[PDB]
């Protein structure tokens, strides 16, 4: 079995490189963040532009949805995060305390916490209601590329240019596990929380049993040497691994066999970001300065 993703929409309107795309948990929306300082909301099924959300003074490296799809959080070169009410577009909170670029962010499943990683080498845990920094984890010795909560929010995984993935107990802030085995440019928990998917800047993705400290799968064939490219588990149809690439393609692998099952062509710059729709076999992809567009792709499986 192989997917047959086909291009459905190309979404133009960002005026600099796109940095990340995320589908809302409820499946209705795609959010995109950009070096142009803007967040844009698009219809997930018709590609229709919905709105622009603004207020950051410098470009944005990441955006994430709350579990109820009502809030967004963005991470900016202006050293802050912002919490936004999506329906209105208003900035609800500005999260201050990082001393350098905020690179990555995520809500926990409860969506009372936000986790952030920064060039300042720290991971911060923030209260959504008050906007106050609850904890500053001295997580890494180099910029932090990714932060992600597990299914129940009890664990955080972080990755860094320093070459480490670390698993943190959310409540205590203590490091429970360091996968110390190249710069790590992306990490996230598997949907069940038992595995982590880690990208390294040696053109390699790895699926790890973090408790066992064992690498279970490796995915290669794409180009990833320069940028923190998002990777995804695709679970709505076939069980795929999805990633952007620096050769301007979207790569799709079979999770179990590790074979490449599809390459999506059409972007004209590095595909910095991909996202998988939560219920339909839909991929969103987005690219850097030479391209500046988002593409939506759909498959029968």
């Amino acid at each position: 079995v192989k997917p047959n993703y086909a291009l459905k929409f190309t979404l133009a309107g960002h005026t600099k490189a796109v940095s990340s795309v995320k589908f809302s948990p409820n499946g209705e929306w795609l959010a995109s963040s950009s070096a142009d300082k803007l967040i844009k909301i698009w219809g997930a099924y018709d590609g229709k532009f919905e709105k622009t959300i603004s207020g950051h003074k410098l470009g944005i490296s990441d955006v994430a949805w709350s579990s109820d799809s009502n809030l967004l959080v963005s991470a900016s070169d202006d050293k802050t995060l912002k919490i936004w009410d999506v329906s209105s577009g208003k900035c609800l909170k500005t999260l201050k305390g990082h001393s350098n670029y905020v690179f990555c962010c995520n809500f926990n499943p409860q969506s009372n916490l936000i986790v952030s990683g920064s060039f300042d080498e720290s991971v911060r845990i923030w209260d959504v209601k008050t906007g106050k920094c609850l904890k500053t984890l001295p997580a890494h010795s180099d910029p932090v590329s990714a932060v992600h909560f597990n299914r129940d929010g009890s664990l955080i995984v972080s990755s860094s240019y320093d070459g480490l993935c670390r698993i943190w107990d959310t409540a205590s802030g203590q490091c429970l596990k360091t996968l110390i085995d190249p710069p790590v440019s992306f990490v996230k928990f598997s949907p069940n929380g038992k595995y982590i998917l880690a990208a390294t800047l040696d053109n390699t993705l790895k699926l790890w049993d973090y408790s066992k400290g064992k690498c279970l799968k490796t995915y290669t064939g794409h180009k990833n040497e320069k940028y923190c490219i998002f990777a995804n588990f695709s679970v709505t149809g076939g069980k795929w691994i999805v990633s952007g690439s620096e050769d301007n393609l979207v790569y799709i692998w079979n999770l179990q066999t590790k074979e490449i099952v599809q390459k999506l062509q059409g972007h004209t710059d590095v595909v910095i970001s991909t996202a998988c729709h939560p219920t339909e076999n839909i991929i969103a992809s987005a690219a850097l300065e030479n391209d500046k567009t988002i593409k939506l792709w759909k498959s029968d499986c």
């Binding site: 600099k16 490189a17 490296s61 900016s76 070169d77 910029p143």
Partner: peptide, 10 residues
């Protein structure tokens, strides 16, 4: 720009 849209290093 934005840090993610630039090459990743300290």
């Amino acid at each position: 720009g934005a840090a993610r849209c630039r090459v990743f290093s300290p």
